[PDB]
């Protein structure tokens with residue numbers, strides 16, 4: 001009995017603390033539904049008893065449907081979930097470290113020590129030319145110490161509908177990227193910033209971003225705009241100078257290469273008007289603008305207050321110059337000046353100034369901002385902000401205030417998202433149930449917004465692979481992907497279960513909206529399934545980290561994710577049946 005094995009949920013983590021409970025498992029069967037061009041995930045949870053085990057390997061057979069059509073084993077990637085330490089933990093250095101299996105790591109062998117849980121992630125890519133049908137296959141588990149092999153009956157049904165490509169949808173996704181963090185971690189030099197040596201470590205993860213739905217691209221326009229909240233500094237992609245004449249000149253060099261990269265990777269297409277450049281921020285931390293004074297040869301700073309005449313003068317110089325620069329590049333139409341949570345005075349000042357400054361064609365900068373909207377009715381001010389993200393904790397569990405607001409914005413063609421961050425449940429922390437990710441995306445469509453935003457693509461601590469612990473926030477909050485190992489030749493990042501569940505959700509809401517468009521007489525019933533979504537309640541654990549109110553609320557998150565997904569594929573079956581019975 002030297003090695004145990006079973007199928008596990010992807011909805012939650014299999015930890016060491018639940019070893020005893022886990023050792024009693026024996027799910028040998030797995031069945032699920034998917035579309036053509038979709039993906040599915042599963043997990044095989046394994047354990048040892050009082051002996052270590054070596055070269056444990058997982059094998060997938062080809063998958064074959066009822067008509068002999070073949071999805072080869074190359075479309076199934078089985079990857080070890082690597083464990084990493086996490087204080088649990090919000091702003092609390094004494095709370096305990098625990099391993100969490102947050103990292104979708106590598107294929108191939110793995111040694112496991114005595115008395116230890118070890119899980120492998122199974123990702124199944126259904127090719128975009130796959131035939132519909134019910135496919136069948138086997139996943140296998142040997143080791144050295146096993147003179148035998150375990151077997152698992154896997155089947156999935158491919159429905160005769162094609163998963164939309166991100167560009168065929170109207171889902172809006174924005175995850176904030178931190179290219180200088182990538183530079184620090186891979187030891188890229190100042191002089192090699194935003195050259196091909198740097199791009200080699202950005203390109204993989206930014207393609208990952210695009211292929212899941214990524215549309216928004218953040219770019220810093222002043223120095224240290226979030227006051228060094230993150231482990232890494234946030235340098236400005238636009239360097240400010242004050243010349244001998246005492247007016248401000250700007251060096252756009254980094255911004256341009258950053259944006260042009262994203263254009264080259266297909267995330268942004270300024271000519272066709274796709275994607276957003278989010279410029280953070282006209283209201284940076286404490287209004288502090290750092291600059292190199294050429295006159296006094298000193299690094300100096302100023303803190304002009306929004307509305308003040310110095311403030312007006314200064315941002316007028318910046319915005320007028322930035323506009324002209326963007327118009328020369330042909331990027332202006334997709335550029336958004338980002339604001340932040342401030343007083344209505346500060347915000348009214350920002351919007352007044354932005355709407356005043358116009359090009360030769362009487363058009364002004366688009367505006368983006370996270371906000372705190374909750375109570376109904378008044379849209380006179382928000383109708384002036386082009387893209388808004390509302391935090392989860394500032395959304396009412398019951399009222400139609402948000403849905404009406406969002407719908408008003410939808411009627412005018414303005415963007416609206418929701419976001420999660422520290423102190424939210426559901427959220428996308430290391431300690432989260434990954435399913436929370438899928439819920440989150442359903443909630444975005446529950447509220448009739450355009451989708452999801454999060455601040456946390458890649459804000460890595462020192463060595464996230466071994467320890468994710470940071471002095472602020474629930475652990476893993478600042479990053480949805482892990483870096484690869486510093487010496488890596490090949491991979492440049494690792495994905496995570498929580499990210500994979502955000503992807504699932506995005507794929508599934510895209511299904512919903514595809515059905516609504518294509519089968520308009522199934523629409524109202526789809527909307528009813530969506531609008532029947534039930535929101536769980538927020539608790540807090542012993543150390544400041546937001547968690548489910550109770551286990552009833554935990555299981556409700558999982559429950560509802562599955563519920564809406566399955567219901568949505570039943571609508572898919574209805575539209576397919578309807579089609580082939582009318583043919």
Ligand SMILES: CC(=O)N[C@H]1[C@H](O[C@@H]2[C@@H](O)[C@H](O)O[C@H](CO)[C@@H]2O)O[C@H](CO)[C@H](O)[C@@H]1O
Nearest residue numbers: 229341370391419421422423454455473477
């Ligand atoms: C958009 C975003 O994620 N912003 C930061 C985020 O800030 C939010 C506030 O905007 C919101 O109103 O209140 C929250 C309370 O915890 C939170 O402060 O916080 C992130 C940290 O998880 C991060 O600092 C973002 O910069």
